[PDB]
């Protein structure tokens, strides 16, 4: 943390953050979500990290070079250490990226290595080559070299993500799935795991072996798994929570804005809220049905009437303010809702649905006040506007993500937040073979457009192909865009160091501090 001159620090430097749900895991290769990543940044540090405003910055690597954007060489700081006092080396990264690529690990982020185009990754994911053929090597203990199959000018931006953090081989090998328990875990971030009570709390304590430990101010942070946004706000206002999770409740937000304006942080956020359609399950494999659901949803009502938290109505998957996004707003978004409703009803009748035989399906969401209230409003709107019947189902976060990967659903509430600020951080998740494709969308034309983005050496041509890829997704109605999120949360006045400037919201508790109050 960088404490400003004259700030008086509190005697006790402890922090309580709500984290939205129980984490899937603490293993960097087994996670895919925001809650998971929130805890992961405090425990495991990759090559680069985000600074307090979100800029890619030195992590374990203190400096790096690239040759033609294809060979990237990272110089690891000599004092980087794990919490057991042993050095973090380039060998740790070689093992870790291999474990990520290895199909036996079944990481949800195995494709992150395809997004960066690390040599031989396609064959490794397919089982054609062993994970040891991955295009990474330790040139010495403090030098990690990555070789890509084509120039990727933004490659380094990918490296602040948890999937490319190191994991301790000896703990993984000796303890297997229990390597993340407090007694067994080894970590190289600013914190160490002290306690993990499932569905109660995760408690982290400062790691004295962290290379930049002298700048760490918070001594202990607790992450809570509260999925009720109303409850989160309640325990923040009671004094227990210092920073809520950034999912705000419809019940109280209007009131909070007027009651505690200075505590309500509302900043840009590169995330899109949408209804994910299972594209491989009839009748959702018919474009007419998917298009009807997309058009009959009234975003103005959801965004401005039912939620009204500053969100913008969405017409694409990639947020239009992503660095590199130059998207074409489709004609259907400019129409009136009445015109969208007629078009929707017309495609539905063409797909064989009648009043006698209506379209009935499930709408899966993860437990939450926000998601439930939004799903109830969406069910009503689709019933009223299009004649479809929806059966709402809630699941806890970890189960919900597994259900979407399994494909055991019809429509699911969904939200993707950028991992790096560039349109492919969204677009690559819709590739046919992406480990993150929970839409189960497979379009050879979409795949080709993205493939072509690294075959040109022009950002103008790249941006045009990204727009065309969004247009292909849209013409196929792969998803139902709802709104672009804003990052809205409550932060006590005494919590210093949270700028709200990073649109990826990659917060590190090592950057924060408690002002005397
Ligand atoms: U004190
Ligand atoms: U106190
Ligand atoms: U650049
Ligand atoms: U940029
Ligand atoms: U269903
Ligand atoms: U509620
Ligand atoms: U460039
Ligand atoms: U106090």
Short mmCIF file of C-alpha atoms and ligand atoms in Angstrom, two decimals:
data_model
loop_
_atom_site.label_atom_id
_atom_site.label_comp_id
_atom_site.label_asym_id
_atom_site.label_seq_id
_atom_site.Cartn_x
_atom_site.Cartn_y
_atom_site.Cartn_z
CA UNK A 1 0.00 0.00 0.00
CA UNK A 2 1.16 3.59 -0.51
CA UNK A 3 -0.18 5.55 2.47
CA UNK A 4 -0.47 9.29 1.70
CA UNK A 5 1.45 11.82 3.77
CA UNK A 6 -0.48 12.91 6.86
CA UNK A 7 -2.97 10.01 6.83
CA UNK A 8 -3.32 8.68 10.38
CA UNK A 9 -3.44 4.86 10.45
CA UNK A 10 -5.81 2.91 12.67
CA UNK A 11 -4.19 0.89 15.45
CA UNK A 12 -5.80 -2.32 14.21
CA UNK A 13 -5.24 -3.04 10.54
CA UNK A 14 -7.91 -5.65 9.81
CA UNK A 15 -10.49 -5.79 7.05
CA UNK A 16 -13.73 -7.66 6.42
CA UNK A 17 -14.86 -8.01 2.81
CA UNK A 18 -18.01 -9.75 1.57
CA UNK A 19 -17.14 -12.08 -1.34
CA UNK A 20 -20.54 -12.93 -2.78
CA UNK A 21 -20.50 -16.71 -2.29
CA UNK A 22 -18.50 -19.69 -1.12
CA UNK A 23 -15.49 -20.13 -3.39
CA UNK A 24 -15.32 -23.04 -5.79
CA UNK A 25 -11.76 -23.70 -4.59
CA UNK A 26 -8.54 -22.04 -3.52
CA UNK A 27 -6.57 -23.94 -6.22
CA UNK A 28 -5.73 -21.47 -9.01
CA UNK A 29 -6.24 -24.17 -11.66
CA UNK A 30 -9.71 -25.15 -10.43
CA UNK A 31 -11.43 -21.69 -10.38
CA UNK A 32 -13.28 -19.51 -12.88
CA UNK A 33 -15.12 -16.84 -10.88
CA UNK A 34 -14.89 -13.36 -9.35
CA UNK A 35 -15.20 -14.58 -5.75
CA UNK A 36 -12.50 -17.19 -6.40
CA UNK A 37 -10.18 -14.65 -8.02
CA UNK A 38 -10.72 -12.11 -5.24
CA UNK A 39 -9.20 -14.53 -2.72
CA UNK A 40 -6.65 -15.83 -5.24
CA UNK A 41 -4.98 -12.41 -5.75
CA UNK A 42 -4.13 -12.16 -2.04
CA UNK A 43 -2.60 -15.66 -1.95
CA UNK A 44 -0.90 -16.48 -5.28
CA UNK A 45 1.15 -14.03 -7.33
CA UNK A 46 1.90 -14.44 -11.02
CA UNK A 47 4.50 -12.89 -13.33
CA UNK A 48 2.65 -9.55 -13.40
CA UNK A 49 -0.03 -8.06 -11.10
CA UNK A 50 -2.37 -5.06 -11.55
CA UNK A 51 -1.28 -1.87 -9.74
CA UNK A 52 -3.89 0.11 -7.73
CA UNK A 53 -5.40 1.61 -10.90
CA UNK A 54 -5.36 -1.68 -12.82
CA UNK A 55 -2.21 -1.27 -15.00
CA UNK A 56 -0.23 -4.49 -15.63
CA UNK A 57 2.76 -4.19 -13.33
CA UNK A 58 5.68 -6.26 -12.06
CA UNK A 59 4.62 -9.26 -9.92
CA UNK A 60 7.11 -12.11 -9.47
CA UNK A 61 8.76 -10.85 -12.68
CA UNK A 62 10.56 -7.52 -12.12
CA UNK A 63 11.22 -6.98 -15.84
CA UNK A 64 10.47 -8.55 -19.21
CA UNK A 65 11.17 -8.35 -22.94
CA UNK A 66 9.61 -9.76 -26.08
CA UNK A 67 11.00 -10.72 -29.47
CA UNK A 68 8.48 -10.06 -32.24
CA UNK A 69 5.68 -10.48 -29.65
CA UNK A 70 6.25 -14.27 -29.91
CA UNK A 71 9.03 -15.01 -27.42
CA UNK A 72 8.50 -13.40 -24.01
CA UNK A 73 11.25 -13.46 -21.41
CA UNK A 74 10.49 -12.76 -17.79
CA UNK A 75 13.19 -11.88 -15.28
CA UNK A 76 12.04 -13.05 -11.87
CA UNK A 77 13.02 -11.05 -8.79
CA UNK A 78 15.60 -12.89 -6.69
CA UNK A 79 13.86 -12.40 -3.37
CA UNK A 80 10.46 -13.83 -4.45
CA UNK A 81 9.52 -16.47 -1.89
CA UNK A 82 6.74 -18.85 -0.91
CA UNK A 83 5.31 -18.62 2.65
CA UNK A 84 7.47 -21.52 3.84
CA UNK A 85 10.54 -19.40 3.02
CA UNK A 86 11.60 -21.24 -0.18
CA UNK A 87 12.30 -19.34 -3.40
CA UNK A 88 9.71 -18.90 -6.16
CA UNK A 89 11.51 -19.96 -9.33
CA UNK A 90 10.90 -20.19 -13.04
CA UNK A 91 10.58 -23.97 -12.49
CA UNK A 92 7.46 -23.27 -10.39
CA UNK A 93 5.90 -21.49 -13.39
CA UNK A 94 6.91 -24.28 -15.79
CA UNK A 95 5.20 -26.89 -13.62
CA UNK A 96 2.18 -24.66 -13.01
CA UNK A 97 1.44 -23.74 -16.64
CA UNK A 98 1.91 -27.42 -17.55
CA UNK A 99 -0.58 -28.43 -14.84
CA UNK A 100 -3.01 -25.85 -16.22
CA UNK A 101 -2.71 -27.26 -19.78
CA UNK A 102 -2.95 -30.92 -18.72
CA UNK A 103 -6.39 -32.36 -19.48
CA UNK A 104 -6.20 -34.48 -16.30
CA UNK A 105 -6.40 -31.22 -14.29
CA UNK A 106 -9.67 -30.41 -16.09
CA UNK A 107 -9.25 -26.70 -15.35
CA UNK A 108 -12.11 -24.46 -16.48
CA UNK A 109 -9.32 -22.13 -17.58
CA UNK A 110 -7.26 -24.66 -19.63
CA UNK A 111 -8.08 -22.49 -22.68
CA UNK A 112 -6.40 -19.41 -21.14
CA UNK A 113 -3.21 -20.89 -22.68
CA UNK A 114 -4.95 -20.98 -26.11
CA UNK A 115 -6.01 -17.31 -25.61
CA UNK A 116 -2.33 -16.47 -25.22
CA UNK A 117 -1.38 -18.97 -27.98
CA UNK A 118 1.40 -20.70 -26.02
CA UNK A 119 3.11 -23.17 -28.38
CA UNK A 120 1.59 -26.67 -28.61
CA UNK A 121 -1.44 -25.94 -26.41
CA UNK A 122 -4.13 -27.25 -28.82
CA UNK A 123 -2.45 -30.72 -29.00
CA UNK A 124 -1.93 -30.82 -25.24
CA UNK A 125 -5.60 -30.03 -24.52
CA UNK A 126 -6.60 -32.72 -27.05
CA UNK A 127 -4.30 -35.35 -25.49
CA UNK A 128 -2.09 -35.60 -28.60
CA UNK A 129 0.98 -34.25 -26.82
CA UNK A 130 2.05 -34.48 -23.18
CA UNK A 131 1.83 -31.27 -21.07
CA UNK A 132 5.65 -31.20 -20.96
CA UNK A 133 5.62 -30.15 -24.63
CA UNK A 134 4.06 -26.81 -23.59
CA UNK A 135 5.97 -23.82 -24.99
CA UNK A 136 7.41 -22.64 -21.65
CA UNK A 137 10.89 -23.17 -20.17
CA UNK A 138 13.01 -22.06 -17.20
CA UNK A 139 16.28 -20.74 -18.69
CA UNK A 140 17.59 -20.61 -15.11
CA UNK A 141 15.95 -20.36 -11.68
CA UNK A 142 15.07 -16.67 -12.24
CA UNK A 143 14.19 -16.57 -15.93
CA UNK A 144 10.93 -17.82 -17.41
CA UNK A 145 10.60 -17.97 -21.21
CA UNK A 146 7.32 -18.33 -23.06
CA UNK A 147 7.07 -19.10 -26.76
CA UNK A 148 3.86 -18.40 -28.67
CA UNK A 149 2.74 -19.76 -32.04
CA UNK A 150 2.05 -16.25 -33.39
CA UNK A 151 2.59 -12.62 -32.36
CA UNK A 152 0.39 -11.49 -29.49
CA UNK A 153 1.09 -7.82 -28.71
CA UNK A 154 -1.19 -7.84 -25.66
CA UNK A 155 0.17 -11.16 -24.27
CA UNK A 156 1.61 -9.66 -21.07
CA UNK A 157 -1.86 -8.21 -20.17
CA UNK A 158 -3.14 -11.77 -19.72
CA UNK A 159 -0.64 -12.55 -16.99
CA UNK A 160 -2.35 -10.97 -13.96
CA UNK A 161 -5.06 -13.75 -14.01
CA UNK A 162 -5.21 -16.50 -11.37
CA UNK A 163 -4.95 -19.37 -13.82
CA UNK A 164 -1.35 -18.38 -14.66
CA UNK A 165 -0.29 -17.97 -11.00
CA UNK A 166 2.18 -20.51 -9.61
CA UNK A 167 1.18 -23.43 -7.41
CA UNK A 168 3.51 -25.35 -5.06
CA UNK A 169 4.27 -28.72 -6.66
CA UNK A 170 5.37 -30.46 -3.47
CA UNK A 171 2.14 -29.57 -1.64
CA UNK A 172 -0.02 -30.54 -4.65
CA UNK A 173 1.79 -33.87 -4.97
CA UNK A 174 1.85 -34.79 -1.28
CA UNK A 175 -1.71 -33.69 -0.37
CA UNK A 176 -3.71 -33.84 -3.61
CA UNK A 177 -7.13 -32.15 -3.29
CA UNK A 178 -6.35 -31.18 0.33
CA UNK A 179 -3.25 -29.12 -0.57
CA UNK A 180 -5.28 -25.94 -0.07
CA UNK A 181 -6.14 -26.67 3.61
CA UNK A 182 -4.51 -24.23 6.06
CA UNK A 183 -2.19 -26.94 7.40
CA UNK A 184 -0.90 -27.83 3.95
CA UNK A 185 -1.10 -24.77 1.72
CA UNK A 186 1.96 -22.80 0.64
CA UNK A 187 1.37 -19.31 -0.90
CA UNK A 188 3.48 -16.58 -2.55
CA UNK A 189 1.13 -13.58 -2.45
CA UNK A 190 0.99 -10.93 0.29
CA UNK A 191 -1.18 -13.19 2.51
CA UNK A 192 -1.32 -16.75 3.84
CA UNK A 193 -4.43 -18.80 4.57
CA UNK A 194 -5.22 -18.83 8.31
CA UNK A 195 -8.74 -20.29 8.45
CA UNK A 196 -11.28 -21.67 5.97
CA UNK A 197 -14.73 -22.43 7.42
CA UNK A 198 -16.97 -23.44 4.49
CA UNK A 199 -20.04 -21.18 4.19
CA UNK A 200 -18.77 -19.06 7.09
CA UNK A 201 -15.48 -17.30 6.43
CA UNK A 202 -12.02 -17.34 4.87
CA UNK A 203 -9.39 -15.59 7.01
CA UNK A 204 -6.06 -14.48 5.50
CA UNK A 205 -3.06 -13.25 7.49
CA UNK A 206 -0.05 -11.33 6.23
CA UNK A 207 2.72 -13.46 4.72
CA UNK A 208 6.08 -12.25 6.13
CA UNK A 209 7.97 -14.01 3.31
CA UNK A 210 6.26 -11.96 0.61
CA UNK A 211 8.92 -10.00 -1.28
CA UNK A 212 7.02 -6.71 -0.85
CA UNK A 213 5.83 -7.37 2.73
CA UNK A 214 7.27 -4.13 4.17
CA UNK A 215 4.64 -2.21 2.07
CA UNK A 216 1.72 -4.43 3.22
CA UNK A 217 -0.44 -2.65 5.81
CA UNK A 218 -3.52 -4.83 6.45
CA UNK A 219 -2.54 -7.66 8.80
CA UNK A 220 -5.66 -9.80 8.39
CA UNK A 221 -8.53 -9.83 5.92
CA UNK A 222 -11.66 -11.96 6.25
CA UNK A 223 -13.69 -12.88 3.15
CA UNK A 224 -17.33 -13.82 3.75
CA UNK A 225 -19.56 -15.95 1.51
CA UNK A 226 -22.86 -14.01 1.74
CA UNK A 227 -24.92 -14.36 -1.45
CA UNK A 228 -27.79 -12.17 -0.21
CA UNK A 229 -26.97 -8.59 -1.25
CA UNK A 230 -29.52 -7.27 1.29
CA UNK A 231 -27.72 -9.19 4.07
CA UNK A 232 -24.36 -7.93 2.85
CA UNK A 233 -25.55 -4.30 3.04
CA UNK A 234 -27.14 -5.06 6.46
CA UNK A 235 -23.86 -6.41 7.92
CA UNK A 236 -21.91 -3.52 6.39
CA UNK A 237 -24.27 -0.98 8.01
CA UNK A 238 -24.17 -2.86 11.30
CA UNK A 239 -20.38 -2.39 11.39
CA UNK A 240 -19.27 -5.98 10.71
CA UNK A 241 -18.36 -5.57 7.00
CA UNK A 242 -15.96 -2.91 5.69
CA UNK A 243 -16.45 -3.48 1.95
CA UNK A 244 -19.54 -5.19 0.48
CA UNK A 245 -19.38 -7.51 -2.53
CA UNK A 246 -20.17 -5.61 -5.78
CA UNK A 247 -23.64 -6.98 -6.44
CA UNK A 248 -26.21 -4.49 -5.03
CA UNK A 249 -29.75 -5.32 -3.81
CA UNK A 250 -32.84 -3.88 -5.47
CA UNK A 251 -34.55 -3.63 -2.08
CA UNK A 252 -32.25 -1.00 -0.57
CA UNK A 253 -30.02 0.67 -3.21
CA UNK A 254 -32.29 3.63 -3.85
CA UNK A 255 -32.32 4.30 -0.07
CA UNK A 256 -28.53 3.82 0.28
CA UNK A 257 -27.86 6.40 -2.42
CA UNK A 258 -29.72 9.05 -0.44
CA UNK A 259 -28.62 7.85 3.00
CA UNK A 260 -24.85 7.30 2.56
CA UNK A 261 -23.70 8.83 -0.76
CA UNK A 262 -19.98 9.03 0.07
CA UNK A 263 -19.87 5.28 0.82
CA UNK A 264 -21.56 4.21 -2.42
CA UNK A 265 -18.78 3.68 -4.98
CA UNK A 266 -20.03 3.36 -8.57
CA UNK A 267 -17.31 2.88 -11.22
CA UNK A 268 -16.83 1.55 -14.73
CA UNK A 269 -16.72 -2.25 -14.92
CA UNK A 270 -15.90 -4.48 -17.88
CA UNK A 271 -18.61 -7.06 -17.32
CA UNK A 272 -21.79 -8.01 -19.15
CA UNK A 273 -25.00 -9.37 -17.57
CA UNK A 274 -26.85 -11.72 -19.94
CA UNK A 275 -29.13 -14.75 -20.16
CA UNK A 276 -26.98 -17.61 -21.43
CA UNK A 277 -28.85 -20.01 -23.76
CA UNK A 278 -27.74 -23.66 -24.04
CA UNK A 279 -27.18 -23.65 -27.81
CA UNK A 280 -26.92 -27.44 -28.12
CA UNK A 281 -30.24 -28.29 -26.47
CA UNK A 282 -33.47 -28.34 -28.48
CA UNK A 283 -35.43 -26.29 -28.81
CA UNK A 284 -32.72 -23.70 -28.12
CA UNK A 285 -30.72 -24.99 -31.08
CA UNK A 286 -33.25 -23.17 -33.32
CA UNK A 287 -32.08 -19.58 -34.00
CA UNK A 288 -35.68 -18.37 -34.21
CA UNK A 289 -36.32 -19.26 -30.58
CA UNK A 290 -33.11 -17.69 -29.37
CA UNK A 291 -33.75 -14.52 -31.39
CA UNK A 292 -37.29 -14.30 -29.98
CA UNK A 293 -36.04 -14.48 -26.38
CA UNK A 294 -33.37 -11.86 -27.12
CA UNK A 295 -35.82 -9.41 -28.70
CA UNK A 296 -38.76 -9.82 -26.28
CA UNK A 297 -36.66 -9.02 -23.24
CA UNK A 298 -37.34 -5.33 -22.48
CA UNK A 299 -33.99 -3.90 -21.36
CA UNK A 300 -35.38 -0.44 -20.64
CA UNK A 301 -37.70 -1.95 -18.02
CA UNK A 302 -35.06 -4.19 -16.48
CA UNK A 303 -32.24 -1.65 -16.57
CA UNK A 304 -34.07 1.61 -15.85
CA UNK A 305 -37.22 0.56 -13.99
CA UNK A 306 -36.61 -2.67 -12.06
CA UNK A 307 -32.86 -2.32 -11.32
CA UNK A 308 -32.01 1.35 -11.95
CA UNK A 309 -28.44 1.21 -10.60
CA UNK A 310 -26.65 2.96 -13.48
CA UNK A 311 -26.34 -0.11 -15.73
CA UNK A 312 -26.44 0.42 -19.50
CA UNK A 313 -28.75 -1.65 -21.75
CA UNK A 314 -26.68 -4.19 -23.66
CA UNK A 315 -26.72 -5.29 -27.30
CA UNK A 316 -23.42 -7.19 -27.41
CA UNK A 317 -21.32 -9.63 -25.34
CA UNK A 318 -18.08 -7.64 -25.26
CA UNK A 319 -18.70 -4.33 -23.41
CA UNK A 320 -18.41 -1.46 -25.89
CA UNK A 321 -15.95 0.39 -23.65
CA UNK A 322 -13.44 -2.48 -23.66
CA UNK A 323 -10.06 -1.21 -24.94
CA UNK A 324 -10.13 -2.10 -28.64
CA UNK A 325 -13.92 -2.36 -28.96
CA UNK A 326 -15.49 -0.45 -31.83
CA UNK A 327 -18.83 -2.25 -32.00
CA UNK A 328 -21.72 -1.80 -34.41
CA UNK A 329 -25.05 -1.32 -32.59
CA UNK A 330 -27.54 -3.64 -34.23
CA UNK A 331 -30.77 -2.29 -35.75
CA UNK A 332 -32.99 -4.34 -33.40
CA UNK A 333 -31.64 -2.41 -30.39
CA UNK A 334 -32.82 0.94 -31.86
CA UNK A 335 -36.34 -0.29 -32.54
CA UNK A 336 -39.22 0.31 -30.14
CA UNK A 337 -40.01 -2.58 -27.75
CA UNK A 338 -43.37 -3.09 -29.48
CA UNK A 339 -41.57 -3.71 -32.76
CA UNK A 340 -39.16 -6.13 -31.03
CA UNK A 341 -42.15 -7.95 -29.45
CA UNK A 342 -43.92 -8.47 -32.80
CA UNK A 343 -40.76 -9.79 -34.46
CA UNK A 344 -40.23 -12.17 -31.51
CA UNK A 345 -43.80 -13.45 -31.56
CA UNK A 346 -43.49 -13.99 -35.33
CA UNK A 347 -40.30 -16.09 -35.07
CA UNK A 348 -41.78 -18.09 -32.20
CA UNK A 349 -44.89 -18.95 -34.26
CA UNK A 350 -42.58 -19.88 -37.14
CA UNK A 351 -40.70 -22.24 -34.80
CA UNK A 352 -43.92 -24.11 -34.00
CA UNK A 353 -45.12 -22.61 -30.72
CA UNK A 354 -48.81 -21.84 -30.18
CA UNK A 355 -51.15 -20.91 -27.32
CA UNK A 356 -52.11 -24.61 -27.16
CA UNK A 357 -48.43 -25.67 -27.21
CA UNK A 358 -46.38 -22.84 -25.67
CA UNK A 359 -42.65 -22.64 -25.08
CA UNK A 360 -41.86 -23.68 -21.50
CA UNK A 361 -38.35 -23.86 -20.07
CA UNK A 362 -36.10 -23.38 -17.05
CA UNK A 363 -34.29 -20.21 -15.99
CA UNK A 364 -31.38 -21.14 -13.78
CA UNK A 365 -29.72 -18.55 -11.55
CA UNK A 366 -27.25 -18.58 -8.65
CA UNK A 367 -28.82 -17.77 -5.25
CA UNK A 368 -29.01 -14.01 -4.85
CA UNK A 369 -31.51 -11.23 -4.13
CA UNK A 370 -30.51 -9.41 -7.27
CA UNK A 371 -30.63 -12.42 -9.61
CA UNK A 372 -33.90 -13.71 -8.20
CA UNK A 373 -35.67 -10.33 -8.52
CA UNK A 374 -34.28 -9.90 -12.05
CA UNK A 375 -35.30 -13.45 -13.05
CA UNK A 376 -38.85 -12.86 -11.71
CA UNK A 377 -39.09 -9.65 -13.76
CA UNK A 378 -37.68 -11.37 -16.87
CA UNK A 379 -40.07 -14.32 -16.46
CA UNK A 380 -43.00 -11.81 -16.29
CA UNK A 381 -41.75 -9.81 -19.27
CA UNK A 382 -41.30 -12.90 -21.43
CA UNK A 383 -44.73 -14.21 -20.38
CA UNK A 384 -46.41 -10.87 -21.18
CA UNK A 385 -44.40 -10.00 -24.29
CA UNK A 386 -43.98 -13.43 -25.85
CA UNK A 387 -46.26 -15.99 -24.23
CA UNK A 388 -43.48 -18.20 -22.80
CA UNK A 389 -43.54 -19.91 -19.40
CA UNK A 390 -40.39 -20.02 -17.32
CA UNK A 391 -39.64 -22.12 -14.27
CA UNK A 392 -37.07 -20.41 -12.08
CA UNK A 393 -34.45 -22.55 -10.37
CA UNK A 394 -31.76 -21.31 -7.92
CA UNK A 395 -28.47 -23.13 -7.24
CA UNK A 396 -25.50 -22.18 -5.03
CA UNK A 397 -22.59 -20.63 -6.97
CA UNK A 398 -20.23 -23.62 -7.21
CA UNK A 399 -23.06 -25.96 -8.29
CA UNK A 400 -24.48 -23.40 -10.73
CA UNK A 401 -21.13 -23.10 -12.57
CA UNK A 402 -20.80 -26.88 -12.79
CA UNK A 403 -24.36 -27.16 -14.15
CA UNK A 404 -23.54 -24.68 -16.93
CA UNK A 405 -20.37 -26.55 -17.87
CA UNK A 406 -22.33 -29.81 -17.85
CA UNK A 407 -24.95 -28.39 -20.20
CA UNK A 408 -27.76 -29.57 -17.85
CA UNK A 409 -29.87 -26.50 -18.48
CA UNK A 410 -32.06 -24.48 -20.81
CA UNK A 411 -31.40 -20.79 -20.05
CA UNK A 412 -29.13 -19.52 -17.30
CA UNK A 413 -28.47 -16.13 -15.74
CA UNK A 414 -24.83 -15.30 -16.61
CA UNK A 415 -22.15 -12.67 -16.32
CA UNK A 416 -18.68 -12.46 -17.75
CA UNK A 417 -16.04 -9.97 -16.57
CA UNK A 418 -12.85 -9.31 -18.56
CA UNK A 419 -9.65 -11.03 -17.45
CA UNK A 420 -7.53 -8.63 -19.49
CA UNK A 421 -8.72 -5.42 -21.16
CA UNK A 422 -9.00 -6.43 -24.85
CA UNK A 423 -12.04 -7.78 -26.69
CA UNK A 424 -10.68 -11.33 -27.03
CA UNK A 425 -10.95 -11.68 -23.22
CA UNK A 426 -14.69 -11.91 -23.96
CA UNK A 427 -14.70 -13.22 -27.54
CA UNK A 428 -12.39 -16.20 -26.93
CA UNK A 429 -14.95 -17.72 -24.55
CA UNK A 430 -17.32 -18.29 -27.49
CA UNK A 431 -14.78 -20.25 -29.57
CA UNK A 432 -16.01 -23.79 -30.29
CA UNK A 433 -13.34 -25.49 -28.18
CA UNK A 434 -13.03 -22.95 -25.33
CA UNK A 435 -12.99 -24.45 -21.82
CA UNK A 436 -15.05 -21.33 -20.84
CA UNK A 437 -17.80 -21.88 -23.47
CA UNK A 438 -20.85 -22.52 -21.24
CA UNK A 439 -23.14 -21.27 -24.05
CA UNK A 440 -22.11 -24.47 -25.89
CA UNK A 441 -22.01 -22.32 -29.02
CA UNK A 442 -19.98 -23.66 -31.95
CA UNK A 443 -19.73 -21.50 -35.07
CA UNK A 444 -16.96 -22.15 -37.58
CA UNK A 445 -17.59 -18.64 -39.03
CA UNK A 446 -17.14 -17.04 -35.56
CA UNK A 447 -14.04 -19.16 -34.91
CA UNK A 448 -12.47 -18.04 -38.19
CA UNK A 449 -13.06 -14.34 -37.50
CA UNK A 450 -11.17 -14.57 -34.19
CA UNK A 451 -8.39 -16.72 -35.73
CA UNK A 452 -7.86 -13.97 -38.30
CA UNK A 453 -7.33 -11.31 -35.61
CA UNK A 454 -3.72 -12.42 -35.04
CA UNK A 455 -3.02 -12.92 -38.75
CA UNK A 456 -3.16 -9.15 -39.35
CA UNK A 457 -0.67 -6.75 -37.65
CA UNK A 458 -3.14 -3.88 -37.54
CA UNK A 459 -5.30 -2.76 -34.62
CA UNK A 460 -7.81 -1.21 -37.03
CA UNK A 461 -8.25 -4.51 -38.86
CA UNK A 462 -8.33 -6.35 -35.51
CA UNK A 463 -11.06 -4.06 -34.17
CA UNK A 464 -13.10 -4.51 -37.36
CA UNK A 465 -12.89 -8.32 -37.03
CA UNK A 466 -13.94 -8.05 -33.37
CA UNK A 467 -16.99 -6.05 -34.47
CA UNK A 468 -17.76 -8.66 -37.14
CA UNK A 469 -17.39 -11.45 -34.56
CA UNK A 470 -19.91 -9.67 -32.31
CA UNK A 471 -22.20 -9.31 -35.34
CA UNK A 472 -21.88 -13.09 -36.01
CA UNK A 473 -22.71 -13.91 -32.38
CA UNK A 474 -25.67 -11.51 -32.60
CA UNK A 475 -26.98 -12.89 -35.89
CA UNK A 476 -26.95 -16.35 -34.30
CA UNK A 477 -28.54 -15.05 -31.07
CA UNK A 478 -26.00 -17.07 -29.05
CA UNK A 479 -26.96 -15.16 -25.88
CA UNK A 480 -29.45 -12.59 -24.56
CA UNK A 481 -27.43 -9.46 -23.65
CA UNK A 482 -29.12 -7.66 -20.78
CA UNK A 483 -26.93 -4.83 -19.43
CA UNK A 484 -23.30 -3.73 -18.98
CA UNK A 485 -22.47 -3.73 -15.29
CA UNK A 486 -21.20 -0.86 -13.27
CA UNK A 487 -19.03 -1.69 -10.28
CA UNK A 488 -21.28 -0.60 -7.39
CA UNK A 489 -20.36 -1.47 -3.78
CA UNK A 490 -20.25 0.18 -0.35
CA UNK A 491 -16.81 1.04 1.10
CA UNK A 492 -16.48 2.44 4.64
CA UNK A 493 -14.91 5.90 4.78
CA UNK A 494 -11.87 4.52 6.67
CA UNK A 495 -10.91 2.07 3.94
CA UNK A 496 -8.07 3.71 2.03
CA UNK A 497 -6.44 2.55 -1.22
CA UNK A 498 -9.54 1.57 -3.25
CA UNK A 499 -9.51 3.91 -6.24
CA UNK A 500 -12.27 2.33 -8.31
CA UNK A 501 -10.09 3.19 -11.33
CA UNK A 502 -9.46 -0.38 -12.49
CA UNK A 503 -12.32 -1.47 -14.77
CA UNK A 504 -11.37 -5.10 -14.10
CA UNK A 505 -11.65 -4.58 -10.29
CA UNK A 506 -8.46 -6.57 -9.61
CA UNK A 507 -8.14 -5.53 -5.96
CA UNK A 508 -5.19 -6.62 -3.83
CA UNK A 509 -5.64 -6.31 -0.05
CA UNK A 510 -1.91 -5.51 0.18
CA UNK A 511 -2.73 -2.11 -1.39
CA UNK A 512 -5.38 -1.08 1.17
CA UNK A 513 -5.12 0.49 4.65
CA UNK A 514 -7.41 1.43 7.54
CA UNK A 515 -7.54 5.13 8.41
CA UNK A 516 -7.96 5.99 12.10
CA UNK A 517 -11.65 6.41 12.91
U1 LIG B 1 -6.05 1.81 20.26
U1 LIG B 2 -11.06 1.35 18.93
U1 LIG B 3 0.84 -1.07 -28.02
U1 LIG B 4 -4.55 0.52 -24.61
U1 LIG B 5 -36.14 -27.99 -18.91
U1 LIG B 6 -35.44 -10.19 -0.58
U1 LIG B 7 0.33 -2.43 -31.96
U1 LIG B 8 -13.09 4.22 17.30
#
